């Protein structure tokens, strides 16, 4: 078949991992999705003239994924800009990914979600500082308005291509 990308969306509970994925796939915004559900989804996309099938694992909790973490090609590190703890927790998710791959050079994109919400507690400069330290892009998103959602997933695809021939 066509080119495939194995994508993994990780981050603390409630940051909008499902919302972002549902947005990419169903083109709408869900207000409540079972935070316990962990599942895979497919999306055919055309990115830079390439017809791609995205294979996306939406993680839930931490206590299928084992294989997806070992074989995942790129990762969205998602926090919510109104959840300081979720931002602080990014470190743990990145370290997890590093340890599995035994590599510092894993395709990743830092995602700051819920941009539609007033009075953020995590400023863009904090987010940019962290992404800069990791050597990865930072993209601000809203799963509610869909701003940045395509940017995040397309950018991760391009990061994967930069890392390996597809
Ligand atoms: N206002 C707003 N709410 C969001 C956004 N993304 C997710 N949510 C909401 O935050 C809550 C958690 O979303 P969810 O997708 O379940 O987070 P998950 O546990 O990481 O999958 C839901 O009520 C969503 O409706 C967003 O971009 N803006
Ligand atoms: C697992 C997701 C979760 O519990 N989260 C995400 C970040 C935090 O906001 C936390 C909450 O949802 N916390 C929370 C606190 C007070 C609430 C009051 C009411 Br009336 C309804 C929901 C609340 C959620
Ligand atoms: Mg979820």
Asked whether 111 and 152 are in contact (CB, 8 A), the reply is yes
DSSP string, 97-131: HHHHHT-S---EEEEEE-TTSSS-SS-HHHHHHHH
List the determination method: X-ray
Asked whether 93 and 121 are in contact (CB, 8 A), the reply is no
Q: At what angle do helices 149-163 and 17-26 cross, to 10 degrees?
A: 90
Q: What is the 3-state secondary structure (H, E, C) of 42-81?
A: EEEEEECCEEEEEEEEECCCCCCHHHHHHHCCEEEEEEEC
Q: Is 6 exposed, middle or buried (0-12, 13-18, 19+ CB in 10 A)?
A: middle
Structural resolution in Å = 1.8
Cα separation of 2 and 51, whole Å?
7
Ligand 2, atom 3, residue with closest C-alpha: 14
Evaluate: CB of 18 within 6 angstroms of ligand 2.
no
Cα separation of 94 and 85, whole Å?
15
Please give the distance, rounded to the nearest whole angstrom, from the Cα atom of residue 125 to the centre of ligand 3. Answer: 27
Q: Report all structural domains of the chain as residue ranges with CATH numbers, in order of start.
A: 1-166 (3.40.50.300)
* 19 CA: nearest ligand 1 atom: 15
């Amino acid at each position: 078949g066509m080119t495939e990308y194995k994508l993994v969306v990780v981050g603390a509970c409630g940051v909008g991992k499902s919302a972002l994925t549902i947005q990419l796939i169903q083109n709408h915004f869900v207000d409540e999705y079972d935070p316990t559900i962990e599942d895979s989804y497919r999306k055919q996309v055309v990115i830079d003239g390439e017809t791609s099938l995205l294979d996306i694992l939406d993680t839930a909790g931490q206590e299928m994924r084992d294989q997806y973490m070992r074989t995942g090609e790129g990762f969205l590190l998602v926090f919510a800009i109104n959840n300081t703890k979720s931002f602080e927790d990014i470190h743990h998710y990145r370290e997890q990914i590093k340890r599995v791959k035994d590599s510092e050079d894993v395709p990743m994109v830092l995602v700051g979600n819920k941009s539609d919400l007033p009075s953020r507690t995590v400023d863009t400069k904090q987010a940019q500082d962290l992404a800069r330290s990791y050597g990865i892009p930072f993209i601000e998103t809203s799963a509610k308005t869909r701003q940045g959602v395509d940017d995040a997933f397309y950018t991760l695809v391009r990061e994967i291509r930069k890392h390996k021939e597809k």
